[PDB]
Amino acid sequence: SRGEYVVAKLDDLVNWARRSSLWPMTFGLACCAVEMMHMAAPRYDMDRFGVVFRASPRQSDVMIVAGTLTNKMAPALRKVYDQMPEPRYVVSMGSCANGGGYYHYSYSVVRGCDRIVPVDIYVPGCPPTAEALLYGILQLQRKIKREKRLRIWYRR
């Protein structure tokens, strides 16, 4: 159907815009943030891919939970995620963020950021290498490329 073709092409345009311009928020909890900065560094510059760190949650599109999320910090993380406008995607970097890692059995650690906020891509490692984080970001971009919001709207 011509309507299906138009919807598919418009969805392609929107997904391309969203994946090409991915603005992570300046959120780094722990050692994994340093590998994130190295990703921002010249060798693996993420600005080439359109990933620009923006501080304000309302002006950001992706939250990368780099570092251990303590029970004290979890409400702030949830608040920052909520204040972030949608579409919003969450990437969990490092074993500490993914499932608690080295401090899984600590009283003051949330055993994974999945408990607090929905996570789209999990980047393994402790710390994950900057190339690994870039791979995760590109995987998130492909995931956005696979999204079918307008097609589902037309079919619904």
Partner: protein, 144 residues
């Protein structure tokens, strides 16, 4: 002047990639139009190039195949597509390409490398690998 030489080198880059169409193809797919020595090509189609003149970290690069394991990778390429044998050459763990120094042949080693399969029907699903520990009594089938 050196400027004329640089422009001529750009034209040589255009020719070396197979013409304007190949030049544009490489530019869009990989964003790099450098021409380098083709060290080899894997069974999946990935072509590996080397330019020792370029600084460390750019001397070796791989042009991912357009089709691998039944997936169209003309635009969607990923690091996992690199087969293990060429992985060490690409990541500079070794200085010898697999063609020059082949890996040891073992029966158990996979013959077809699979890329990251997360988000696909082939994605790994965790499960317990141990049998039931406690066995329950089976009631008798006779009434009494």
């Amino acid at each position: 002047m050196e400027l004329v030489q640089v422009l001529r080198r750009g034209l040589q880059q255009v020719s070396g990639h197979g013409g304007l169409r190949g030049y544009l193809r490489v530019l869009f797919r990989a964003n790099d139009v450098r021409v380098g020595t083709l060290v080899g090509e894997d069974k999946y189609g990935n072509k590996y190039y080397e330019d020792n003149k370029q600084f460390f970290g750019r001397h070796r690069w791989v042009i991912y195949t357009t089709e691998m394991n039944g997936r169209d990778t003309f635009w969607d390429v990923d690091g996992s597509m690199v087969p293990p044998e060429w992985h060490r050459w690409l990541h500079c763990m070794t200085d010898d390409p697999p063609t020059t120094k082949p890996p040891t042949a073992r029966k158990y080693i996979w013959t077809n490398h699979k890329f990251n399969v997360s988000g696909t029907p082939q994605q790994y699903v965790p499960y317990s690998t141990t049998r039931k520990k406690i066995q329950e009594w089976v009631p008798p089938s006779t009434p009494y």
